[PDB]
Design a protein around this ligand. Structure first.
Ligand SMILES: Nc1nc2c(ncn2[C@@H]2O[C@H](COP(=O)(O)O)[C@@H](O)[C@H]2O)c(=O)[nH]1
Ligand SMILES: Nc1nc2c(ncn2[C@@H]2O[C@H](COP(=O)(O)O)[C@@H](O)[C@H]2O)c(=O)[nH]1
Ligand SMILES: Nc1nc2c(ncn2[C@@H]2O[C@H](COP(=O)(O)O)[C@@H](O)[C@H]2O)c(=O)[nH]1
Lengths: 303, 319
């Protein structure tokens, strides 16, 4: 019995809409292939409830879903079950726009009109890419794209699989791009410090994962950025989280489900401090240069 | 469990889609202690524009409105009808035969007029209290839902009721009795249908009677007494007693014949489902089952008189 109780009507509508659309798709046969129109399709539903159901939801709102067939396919290829997705969004209000489902499994980012256009611009090539690499990638995993309309105001959203574990606490992150980029004094003091490539290399920090993972990671990181190039995109960073097992050891720690924390990596026997690294590409909605720059700076962290 | 909402017509798919949607949505709406006045003025509305998507059964574009959802959900409980049953009878397969039945013959679906929908609202408060204080014991139409559908910009109003006739037992002869002293009979046209809707004078000139037995006669005339007064307390006139007669032996042969036709219990029912049904007195000529209800209450004579007249006719119809 979902109330869609949220700190904000936009959120409730989001819960309502994700619920509605996922349900609706369950009466829609999974097809043998996606079609060209699927990339131009959408669903729109306008609600107008006079004097009814007003406790959590607005009375009047719109909810549009972009390319529901493509994104539903994307979910499967990413090994995400629609009813899990749905339950993550609808069972409890997402939290802190940049949100996560209450179970830290999915991220919900507000985006712009042009973001949504760029998404449409690259979606067929990105689907084709997901297919070809069998969903094995460091790229953002796009699960859904929506436009909510509440009080006349349109709001765009994009849902990705979270980068950081939904369980194992991160203790240090690093937004990396491969100029001058450090952490500002106005940020350097906070529960979660978001670093950058300068404060990293100068910090003599490395990620010890074994040559066996360097092989998977790089062999992926290469085809991924090569793909972003051919799409003539740039400014994408490499989000990197560290989880020192001890700091939290203070059921087991360092324990995680690779099928859920898809971005996680164990350190190697032949390594110093014992930790879990979370690594993926972020911010891809916007040269062969940026690519090879990126690739190089990131190869150097993997020993 | 895929519901395609496949139907011989867009309108029907939309109906299936709408009843499905509204019932699920209600399922997330807690059950109220009491109804509030606003609940009688309330409605839900949804408009769908699906572009290049989900077009194989549903239209791409449509509207679905439900009137006073809270009140009809309650009317449903008060008639011992479960929402999920209702939803399933409407959605599991297309309604069939502006009169429709659900694929399983439990519920009737009338296409009504804007006028009719309008009269529903007038009487909706007073109707609900009536059902409350008769605990659901009435020969009156039992209203389960009212909706407006929009397909191709065209608006169709529907009212859902419980079916008067048994979902199982075949009807072999039906009547529409009023009592009006004008001439009511069956046209030579109707007369030559399969199941002619016979009228007052036919029932009389046929000398028909229904042998229900006294315990049953009293309870029926008591329902009817309070039912037709309530109607009179409103402007309401010209409504009817729908009378179905089921012949148990005749059905038993018909069944027998249907088995040998394909290859190449009898007389009983659930009074919690077939709510209008009555068994014939064990001292009856033929073994029969009757179905008796009031119908058409929405759309030199007057209400109070009609009630007294209608009541007196029906009471002289049974023994
Ligand atoms: N009394 C009453 N009539 C209504 C109400 N809502 C709609 N109606 C009537 O029902 C019919 C259909 O209205 P619609 O829903 O298409 O606007 C019209 O006769 C309209 O005036 C209501 O809340 N109260
Ligand atoms: N759409 C709508 N129609 C109404 C409403 N209330 C009354 N009506 C319409 O306007 C008329 C008013 O009649 P009354 O309220 O005096 O019985 C009714 O015939 C009905 O069709 C309402 O709240 N909404
Ligand atoms: N009343 C009655 N009629 C029967 C019975 N068996 C057959 N008939 C009727 O006799 C005719 C021929 O029956 P058939 O054996 O060809 O089904 C049909 O009109 C059929 O309905 C029966 O047991 N009772």
């Amino acid at each position: 019995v979902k109330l869609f109780r949220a700190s904000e009507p936009i959120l409730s509508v989001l819960m309502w809409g994700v619920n509605h659309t996922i349900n609706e798709l369950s009466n829609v046969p999974v097809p043998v292939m996606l079609m060209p129109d699927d990339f131009k399709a959408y669903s729109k539903i306008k609600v107008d409830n006079h004097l009814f159901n007003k406790e959590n939801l607005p009375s009047r709102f719109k909810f549009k879903e972009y390319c529901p067939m493509v994104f539903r396919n994307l979910r499967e290829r990413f090994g995400i079950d629609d009813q899990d997705y749905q339950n993550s969004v609808t069972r409890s209000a997402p939290i802190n726009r940049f949100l996560t489902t209450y179970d830290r499994r999915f991220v919900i980012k507000t985006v712009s009109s042009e973001d949504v256009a760029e998404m449409h611009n690259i979606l067929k090539k990105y689907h084709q890419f997901i297919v070809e690499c069998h969903g094995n990638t460091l790229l953002p995993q796009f699960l859904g794209m929506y436009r909510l309309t509440v009080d006349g105001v349109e709001t765009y959203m994009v849902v990705t699989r979270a980068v950081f574990s939904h369980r194992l606490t991160v203790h240090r992150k690093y937004d990396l791009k491969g100029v001058a980029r450090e952490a500002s004094d106005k940020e350097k003091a906070k529960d979660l410090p978001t670093f950058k490539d300068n404060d990293f290399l100068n910090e003599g920090q490395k990620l010890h994962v074994g040559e066996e993972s360097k092989k998977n990671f790089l062999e992926k990181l290469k085809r991924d950025v090569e793909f972003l190039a051919q799409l003539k995109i740039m400014d994408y960073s490499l989000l990197v989280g560290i989880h020192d097992v001890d700091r939290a050891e203070q059921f087991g720690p360092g324990e995680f489900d690779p099928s859920v924390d898809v971005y996680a990596m164990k350190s190697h026997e032949s390594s110093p401090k014992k930790e879990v690294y979370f690594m993926a590409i972020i911010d891809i909605l916007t040269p062969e240069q940026y690519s090879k720059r990126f690739n190089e700076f990131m190869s150097n962290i993997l020993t």
